[PDB]
Design a protein around this nucleic acid. Structure first.
Lengths: 138, 136
RNA sequence: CGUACGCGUCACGCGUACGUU
RNA sequence: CGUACGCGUCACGCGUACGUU
């Protein structure tokens, strides 16, 4: 039940009530904008946070600029993630996961809920490194 | 599968086995006896693994968390050792490559198509450095 | 730490099919 | 980009069985 909600949360845009790890709405292109863009470097990246069975996802446009980098880095925070986790974490430990994919490479951070703080430090760092691997241009 | 089985076994070839491996340092897994003993007196080391398609190699290296040791285990593999070892399995067709490492409850897995193998190595080494430097 | 399996879940590669939200 | 099937795999959470290498 909560799993189906977290899945649909990706499309609640502004409104919504289910606590989420993300602080910026999804930006998935319509199928049309997609193929149309693939006639002209990547539109953006995709990422997801999962607290057990409850997985949340986001596709964010990212043009590789400094401004753009700073913007998507605010997609989530340790706080936003910890707060959302408390709402679905029992007195038990469950598998948690953060995963991001860009320019083909995919990074996945994972472990039990007890290490969530560490998952968050690793995830934020992996995120910036993956998004800054030697520019596609050169 | 066979080549997959030789790769699994490579971990235990101890002293050369003729098989091309992405790793440059010999495994250092503790015997079940040495392990029980240590778990009586944080962890002994960490586990990493490289896979090219289903041809997976692995290692467990002792790590104590000192700059000296960090530099040592950081050499268990290089861009060169990985790429070369990969060529002998390339396959001319794209296959799913991978790198995973686990230390202190946290696991990092870098996944990519053979074409992106050069970036995988970049992300993998950075993930490795960072992960091994996490402190409670 | 090493084998094998079970329940749940996640991610990559290859093949393919649908969708002009 | 989305949603799906198929084949091959990285790996995590929970738990069993087996191993004096």
């Amino acid at each position: 039940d909560t799993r189906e909600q977290a899945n649909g949360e990706r499309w609640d845009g502004g409104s919504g009530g289910i606590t989420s790890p993300f602080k910026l709405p999804d930006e998935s292109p319509s199928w049309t904008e997609w193929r149309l863009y693939n006639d002209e470097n990547p539109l953006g990246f995709k990422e997801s946070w999962g607290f057990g069975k409850v997985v949340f996802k986001r596709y964010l446009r990212y043009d590789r600029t400094e401004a753009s980098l700073h913007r998507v880095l605010g997609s989530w925070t340790g706080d936003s993630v910890n707060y959302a986790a408390s709402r679905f974490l029992g007195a038990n430990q469950v598998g948690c996961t953060y995963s991001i994919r860009f320019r083909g490479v995919s990074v996945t951070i994972s472990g039990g809920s007890r290490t969530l703080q560490h998952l968050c430090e690793m995830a934020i760092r992996s995120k910036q490194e993956l998004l800054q691997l030697t520019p596609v241009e050169v």
